[PDB]
Amino acid sequence: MLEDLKRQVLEANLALPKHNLVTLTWGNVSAVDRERGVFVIKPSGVDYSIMTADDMVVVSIETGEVVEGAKKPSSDTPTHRLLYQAFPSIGGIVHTHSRHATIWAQAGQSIPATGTTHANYFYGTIPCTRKMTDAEINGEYEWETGNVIVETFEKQGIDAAQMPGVLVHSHGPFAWGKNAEDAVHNAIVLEEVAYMGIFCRQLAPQLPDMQQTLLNKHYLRKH
Amino acid sequence: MLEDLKRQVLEANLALPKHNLVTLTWGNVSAVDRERGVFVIKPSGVDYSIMTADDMVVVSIETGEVVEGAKKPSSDTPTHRLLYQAFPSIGGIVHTHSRHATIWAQAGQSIPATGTTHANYFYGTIPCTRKMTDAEINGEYEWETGNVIVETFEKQGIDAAQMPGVLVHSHGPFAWGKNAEDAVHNAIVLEEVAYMGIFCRQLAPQLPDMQQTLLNKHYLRKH
Amino acid sequence: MLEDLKRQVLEANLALPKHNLVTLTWGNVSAVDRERGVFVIKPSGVDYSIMTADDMVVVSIETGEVVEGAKKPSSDTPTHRLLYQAFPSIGGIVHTHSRHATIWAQAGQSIPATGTTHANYFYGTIPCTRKMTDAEINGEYEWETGNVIVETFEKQGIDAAQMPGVLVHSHGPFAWGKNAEDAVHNAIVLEEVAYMGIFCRQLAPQLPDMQQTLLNKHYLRKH
Amino acid sequence: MLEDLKRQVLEANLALPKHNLVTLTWGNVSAVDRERGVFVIKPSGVDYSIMTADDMVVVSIETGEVVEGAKKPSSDTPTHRLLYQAFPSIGGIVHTHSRHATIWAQAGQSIPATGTTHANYFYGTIPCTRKMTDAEINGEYEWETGNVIVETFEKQGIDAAQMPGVLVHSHGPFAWGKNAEDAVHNAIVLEEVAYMGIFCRQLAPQLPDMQQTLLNKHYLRKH
Ligand SMILES: [Zn+2]
Ligand SMILES: [Zn+2]
Ligand SMILES: [Zn+2]
Ligand SMILES: [Zn+2]
Numbered sequence: 042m043l044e045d046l047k048r049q050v051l052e053a054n055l056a057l058p059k060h061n062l063v064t065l066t067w068g069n070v071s072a073v074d075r076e077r078g079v080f081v082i083k084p085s086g087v088d089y090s091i092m093t094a095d096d097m098v099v100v101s102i103e104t105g106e107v108v109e110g111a112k113k114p115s116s117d118t119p120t121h122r123l124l125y126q127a128f129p130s131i132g133g134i135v136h137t138h139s140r141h142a143t144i145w146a147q148a149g150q151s152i153p154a155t156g157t158t159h160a161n162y163f164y165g166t167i168p169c170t171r172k173m174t175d176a177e178i179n180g181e182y183e184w185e186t187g188n189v190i191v192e193t194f195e196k197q198g199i200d201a202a203q204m205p206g207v208l209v210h211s212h213g214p215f216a217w218g219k220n221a222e223d224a225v226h227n228a229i230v231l232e233e234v235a236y237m238g239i240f241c242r243q244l245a246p247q248l249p250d251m252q253q254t255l256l257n258k259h260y261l262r263k264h
Numbered sequence: 265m266l267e268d269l270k271r272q273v274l275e276a277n278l279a280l281p282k283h284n285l286v287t288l289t290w291g292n293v294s295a296v297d298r299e300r301g302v303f304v305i306k307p308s309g310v311d312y313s314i315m316t317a318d319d320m321v322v323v324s325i326e327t328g329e330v331v332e333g334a335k336k337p338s339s340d341t342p343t344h345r346l347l348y349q350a351f352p353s354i355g356g357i358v359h360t361h362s363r364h365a366t367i368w369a370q371a372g373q374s375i376p377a378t379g380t381t382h383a384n385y386f387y388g389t390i391p392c393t394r395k396m397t398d399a400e401i402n403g404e405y406e407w408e409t410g411n412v413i414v415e416t417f418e419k420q421g422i423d424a425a426q427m428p429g430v431l432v433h434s435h436g437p438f439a440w441g442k443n444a445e446d447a448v449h450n451a452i453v454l455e456e457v458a459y460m461g462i463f464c465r466q467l468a469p470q471l472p473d474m475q476q477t478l479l480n481k482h483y484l485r486k487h
Numbered sequence: 488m489l490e491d492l493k494r495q496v497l498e499a500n501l502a503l504p505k506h507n508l509v510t511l512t513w514g515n516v517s518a519v520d521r522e523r524g525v526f527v528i529k530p531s532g533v534d535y536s537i538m539t540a541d542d543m544v545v546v547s548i549e550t551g552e553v554v555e556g557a558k559k560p561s562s563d564t565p566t567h568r569l570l571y572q573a574f575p576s577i578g579g580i581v582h583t584h585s586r587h588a589t590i591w592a593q594a595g596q597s598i599p600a601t602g603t604t605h606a607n608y609f610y611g612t613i614p615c616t617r618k619m620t621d622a623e624i625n626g627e628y629e630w631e632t633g634n635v636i637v638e639t640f641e642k643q644g645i646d647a648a649q650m651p652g653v654l655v656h657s658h659g660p661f662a663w664g665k666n667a668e669d670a671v672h673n674a675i676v677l678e679e680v681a682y683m684g685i686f687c688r689q690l691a692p693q694l695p696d697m698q699q700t701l702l703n704k705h706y707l708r709k710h
Numbered sequence: 711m712l713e714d715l716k717r718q719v720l721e722a723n724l725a726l727p728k729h730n731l732v733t734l735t736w737g738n739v740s741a742v743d744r745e746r747g748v749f750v751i752k753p754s755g756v757d758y759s760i761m762t763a764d765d766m767v768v769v770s771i772e773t774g775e776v777v778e779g780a781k782k783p784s785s786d787t788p789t790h791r792l793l794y795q796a797f798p799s800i801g802g803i804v805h806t807h808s809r810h811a812t813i814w815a816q817a818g819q820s821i822p823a824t825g826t827t828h829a830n831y832f833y834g835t836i837p838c839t840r841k842m843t844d845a846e847i848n849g850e851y852e853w854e855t856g857n858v859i860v861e862t863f864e865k866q867g868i869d870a871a872q873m874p875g876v877l878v879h880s881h882g883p884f885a886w887g888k889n890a891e892d893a894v895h896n897a898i899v900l901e902e903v904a905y906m907g908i909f910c911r912q913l914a915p916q917l918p919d920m921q922q923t924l925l926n927k928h929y930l931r932k933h
Contacts, residue, residue: 064456065449067381138381144460147379147474148467156593157658158513158584175477182481211474212380226511233510237590239463240685244594251593251657254621258628287902288895290827361827367906370825370920371913398923405927434920435826462909602816603881604736604807672734679733683813686908690817697816697880700844704851 042109043081046072047097050081053221054097057137058089060229068137069115072221073125078102080125084112102126116183123187124217128201131217133224141235142206142214145169149210152231152238153250159234160251160259162227164203167234168193172210190215203260206231265332266304269295270320273304276444277320280360281312283452291360292338295444296348301325303348307335325349339406346410347440351424354440356447364458365429365437368392372433375454375461376473382457383474383482385450387426390457391416395433413438426483429454488555489527492518493543496527499667500543503583504535506675514583515561518667519571524548526571530558548572562629569633570663574647577663579670587681588652588660591615595656598677598684599696605680606697606705608673610649613680614639618656636661649706652677711778712750715741716766719750722890723766726806727758729898737806738784741890742794747771749794753781771795785852792856793886797870800886802893810904811875811883814838818879821900821907822919828903829920829928831896833872836903837862841879859884872929875900 053070057063066089071082084096098110098118105122107114115121121134145152152167154160159167170193177185190207193199205227206216216231218224241248276293280286289312294305307319321333321341328345330337338344344357368375375390377383382390393416400408413430416422428450429439439454441447464471499516503509512535517528530542544556544564551568553560561567567580591598598613600606605613616639623631636653639645651673652662662677664670687694722739726732735758740751753765767779767787774791776783784790790803814821821836823829828836839862846854859876862868874896875885885900887893910917 064452138379140456140460141463143379143381144463144467147460147464148471150467155657156584156589158589172475173478175475178475178477178481211378211478229510233586237586237593239467240587240590241593243466243689244590244596244685248594252618252621252624254624255619255657258624287898361825363902363906364909366825366827367909367913370906370910371917373913395921396924398921401921401923401927434824434924462913466912601880602807602812604812675733679809683809683816686810686813687816689912690813690819690908694817698841698844698847700847701842701880704847 042099043074043077043079044094046074046081047094047099049221050083050097051092051094053133053135053225054083054092055089056222056225057135060225062137062139062228062232064138068135069117069121070133070135070221070225071115071118071121072133072224073102073131075102079108080121082118082121083115084110085115087112119181119183120187120190120215123184124190124215127187127191128217130202131205131224132219133217133221135216135218135224135228136213137228138213139228139232139235141239142208142232143212144239145235146208146213147211151208152235154256155238155241155248155251156234157251157255157259158230158237160256161263162230162260163206163234164260165199165256166250167204167206167208167231168197168199169208170210186212265322266297266300266302267317269297269304270317270322272444273306273320274315274317276356276358276448277306277315278312279445279448280358283448285360285362285451285455287361291358292340292344293356293358293444293448294338294341294344295356295447296325296354298325302331303344305341305344306338307333308338310335342404342406343410343413343438346407347413347438350410350414351440353425354428354447355442356440356444358439358441358447358451359436360451361436362451362455362458364462365431365455366435367462368458369431369436370434374431375458377479378461378464378471378474379457380474380478380482381453381460383479384486385453385483386429386457387483388422388479389473390427390429390431390454391420391422392431393433409435488545489520489523489525490540492520492527493540493545495667496529496543497538497540499579499581499671500529500538501535502668502671503581506671508583508585508674508678510584514581515563515567516579516581516667516671517561517564517567518579518670519548519577521548525554526567528564528567529561530556531561533558565627565629566633566636566661569630570636570661573633573637574663576648577651577670578665579663579667581662581664581670581674582659583674584659585674585678585681587685588654588678589658590685591681592654592659593657597654598681600702601684601687601694601697602680603697603701603705604676604683606702607709608676608706609652609680610706611645611702612696613650613652613654613677614643614645615654616656632658711768712743712746712748713763715743715750716763716768718890719752719766720761720763722802722804722894723752723761724758725891725894726804729894731806731808731897731901733807737804738786738790739802739804739890739894740784740787740790741802741893742771742800744771748777749790751787751790752784753779754784756781788850788852789856789859789884792853793859793884796856796860797886799871800874800893801888802886802890804885804887804893804897805882806897807882808897808901808904810908811877811901812881813908814904815877815882816880820877821904823925824907824910824917824920825903826920826924826928827899827906829925830932831899831929832875832903833929834868834925835919836873836875836877836900837866837868838877839879855881
């Protein structure tokens with residue numbers, strides 16, 4: 042029904058393995074069409090090497106019901122859905138277990154801004170969520186994963202339009218952007234700064250976060 | 265005699281270098297046919313770039329005798345054989361010296377479950393065996409390697425159907441699955457969580473294992 | 488106007504992703520034509536996969552004005568320009584956020600010469616600049632970035648003709664050479680010794696810099 | 711004059727970049743023909759992408775004089791020559807600055823045998839030479855590099871036929887084998903165990919070397 046959108050999502054999903062952000066069939070990308078009140082996401086149970094635009098599922102932003110698609114949508118759909126409702130300014134969402142961002146997630150630590158690379162895409166510390174409670178995990182898990190992300194941002198007063206990424210404790214990174222592609226680009230940068238953050242800490246364990254002035258210069262410049 | 269099986273094993277063996285789990289000619293994959301009472305394994309002394317389905321050797325589960333094949337079977341055949349007898353629920357076995365899982369093996373340490381990535385494929389700590397005794401090593405080595413793996417699981421009360429992987433002290437990883445391919449996939453995940461485990465420990469040296477509830481959620485969900 | 492130069496710069500810019508020194512559209516290479524009093528640099532807002540020789544911008548060494556080009560020049564142009572004026576003996580300049588050199592930059596640490604690999608291309612410690620002041624950052628930023636590099640070399644008495652590289656605190660590496668290509672080669676070596684420096688320090692935290700005699704032997708030999 | 715030999719050396723040299731053991735034009739492989747009293751080595755000043763069998767230089771084992779070749783031989787030729795004279799049982803020599811083996815070399819540390827991977831190709835600790843003296847470095851450098859390697863083996867009573875590799879302090883690895891190809895394979899394994907050695911030490915800083923029985927089992931088995 043939104044072929045050009047299914048195209049953008051399809052291509053973004055195929056970009057995941059190309060940029061070495063995923064292995065096997067992990068990861069998923071989706072894009073939203075606000076006026077349509079629906080979002081398109083990667084299908085569940087489909088290899089990237091077989092995946093076609095027609096496999097992309099159409100889901101209702103409001104009810105989470107599949108508006109079009111023969112395939113089952115990604116099991117992470119509720120999280121995507123929740124985030125679209127919570128963050129009005131986002132147009133695309135990426136979820137992967139990219140190695141280095143996931144290392145930070147598993148460590149339960151937030152990625153501090155120590156470089157201009159990071160400053161160009163994330164306005165400050167990339168937050169790692171608190172652990173989910175036993176209740177949240179055994180309840181509507183994916184949806185709750187979304188709630189934990191949103192709570193993290195509200196409690197810490199972080200603007201989602203200025204921080205297109207987050208780490209889910211013991212799980213992995215979630216990133217987003219203006220559209221499917223933009224979302225994928227933010228995901229690849231999140232992985233890059235995660236990688237560099239590990240080793241810059243090793244070289245300088247008592248390294249202070251970058252100068253606020255430098256952070257501002259680079260983030261405010263773009264956007 | 266089981267061309268379709270020799271095909272599955274051949275392709276799984278060719279997948280090893282493609283997924284960067286092996287170098288030169290290290291590694292080997294095999295698949296079993298219970299009703300036939302035989303398993304098919306990679307040949308010894310054959311480059312992956314030359315390897316053909318006909319090179320796959322057929323071996324007796326009960327006697328370890330080669331039922332069909334011009335080439336000599338992998339020197340690890342006894343280990344595979346032992347594991348098939350010991351673990352009834354397995355249909356394929358992978359052995360490699362994939363770098364990161366091997367780093368843990370050489371360190372003689374078990375890979376703790378610190379993420380959902382790990383939880384999705386291994387139900388808990390991926391065990392590293394104790395060192396083999398001088399007698400075991402100088403006896404029927406490969407077979408003894410199998411016995412050490414099995415003892416590890418029995419002593420620690422770990423169900424092989426829920427933990428498709430193990431690290432052999434000072435040696436390397438062994439993984440298995442429902443079939444040759446499934447076995448290969450578990451092998452690649454074992455390498456991924458081994459990689460991430462190294463660095464998540466570095467970021468958080470006193471990091472506790474993941475929440476049991478989270479572990480259960482992810483493992484019990486699949487399967 | 489200098490097609491053969493735009494060719495050299497174009498090809499050098501396309502070499503950046505090929506040598507895994509860049510991601511997305513980061514990085515930029517330029518080459519100068521002293522007699523012409525102009526330098527050619529990568530355009531801003533152009534994917535490497537689309538980039539053509541015609542996209543290369545021509546800029547005035549003296550005024551920084553674009554002498555020819557439909558596209559906007561890289562935002563790092565002022566830095567390049569400043570460096571050409573400051574260092575007469577350089578013919579090409581490379582700027583990237585290559586992961587490992589950037590890790591050192593973010594750590595705010597200089598890369599010590601601990602090997603012959605390093606000695607072959609950099610005559611001594613590869614310097615990391617001091618942090619830029621709030622004023623410098625909020626002023627003519629790129630130009631000031633150049634001034635900080637130059638001050639680093641003058642204060643520390645380092646000859647730019649013998650040290651074709653520098654790390655900008657919290658930012659990334661800048662490298663240069665006799666021409667666009669030579670500049671790119673120095674950039675790739677800077678990344679290699681940055682990578683090895685991290686881990687050689689890990690293996691030997693109290694490792695002294697390499698023998699001066701060895702350093703001299705290798706650097707003075709070439710050149 | 712020995713086209714089939716120039717072929718083996720050519721192909722081995724082209725294998726260096728393919729196995730990611732080299733960058734730019736670093737590294738060199740050579741093979742010897744004892745009965746002929748000559749060895750063939752990679753030429754100096756030739757990109758791997760242009761390199762042809764005819765570019766391979768023929769050198770006298772006894773005098774180090776070029777018996778055939780339009781191109782200048784690798785600057786490491788004296789080292790190769792010395793090693794051929796010193797170690798009668800070797801038929802090929804590889805020299806690279808492969809990242810991880812070089813990290814150990816720069817750290818001035820020997821790679822301890824902590825795994826079967828290592829045991830399969832190197833019978834024990836892979837030695838790192840002592841630092842060269844100012845005199846050795848400023849004398850016939852490459853030849854002296856060879857003498858330091860040989861002294862290392864004699865002083866420590868290590869059989870070159872059982873240890874096809876060595877690390878030259880602050881420099882890089884040298885490996886050898888029965889022929890050009892065998893030499894290249896040993897070089898790639900040296901890099902693999904160097905990589906794993908770094909991180910296995912990190913996981914277990916007080917890790918003892920592998921069981922002698924295990925070391926013997928694996929090395930004595932092959933060969
Ligand atoms: Zn996930
Ligand atoms: Zn093995
Ligand atoms: Zn930059
Ligand atoms: Zn060298």
